Amino acid sequence: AIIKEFMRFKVHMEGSVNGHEFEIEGEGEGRPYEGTQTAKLKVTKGGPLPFAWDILSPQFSKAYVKHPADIPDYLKLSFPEGFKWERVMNFEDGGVVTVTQDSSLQDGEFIYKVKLRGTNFPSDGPVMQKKTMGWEASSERMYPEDGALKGEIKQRLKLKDGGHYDAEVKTTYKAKKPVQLPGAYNVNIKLDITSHNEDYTIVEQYERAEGRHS
């Protein structure tokens, strides 16, 4: 057995945002064929963080996307070896987040390792001032290119004052060994922060994700 209908994961992230270094450790679980999962994350170094948790939340699992039977589930098929991904988020005010990630399978659990660098967030912007309140539901346009699977998202953060704050996100996903790529399709995603302590050093998340034909 490689992927069961219920799977746990462990995640470690090391990051820096506007020069502030930190580490996070977490554990999650979900139902990969149903497209649902949760995670509990803890800031283990560099806490409390001086910036919005919301820029980190999408970095903590695309093996848990429900796919129609006729769309190859490339990231599931990459196991047991797994896959890597690289992401750039370009925020409307010039902040940039670059992310690299490795996903593997060890003793029946997924293992995630994340490296993140954020730069150029304005000091009075909503990220450094912690003025965000969660992502709106996203649709990621997926397409094969250069032997990899790529995704593009127009992502939108809610602001506490009622406004919104946008980012353009591009990700490249690459299986460690060659497996069958899909055609172009969409992945619908909704990510929720379901609980947090006062300074966001312990945070719980829930995500639902489902692939659909364009």
Added chain:
Amino acid sequence: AQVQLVESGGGLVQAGGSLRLSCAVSGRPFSEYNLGWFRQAPGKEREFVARIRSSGTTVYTDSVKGRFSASRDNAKNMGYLQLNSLEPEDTAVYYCAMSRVDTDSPAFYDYWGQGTQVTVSTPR
């Protein structure tokens, strides 16, 4: 609530491995029904795999004989399909269905599950 058949037990496994599919039935006196299993791979038509009659006798399509085994537990309102010695060609969505008609034809089945994905890979 409405009659429901719910498959579980699928996933991704390497060739030669095994999975145990199950079908949980609600809303009917399960012991009266025959339970059929069908599968559909991408680009192909859905095909009969196996069935267990209300009487307990079983029928298998030729390509799965000696590898797959259908059983039932009436007290649990459950049917089972044990998949042993899996091959890449067994990759498909597997469906359970029930009827009081004894047949391999999907046309006479009254209720269908939503399906469970079974993917059999080759090692590399």
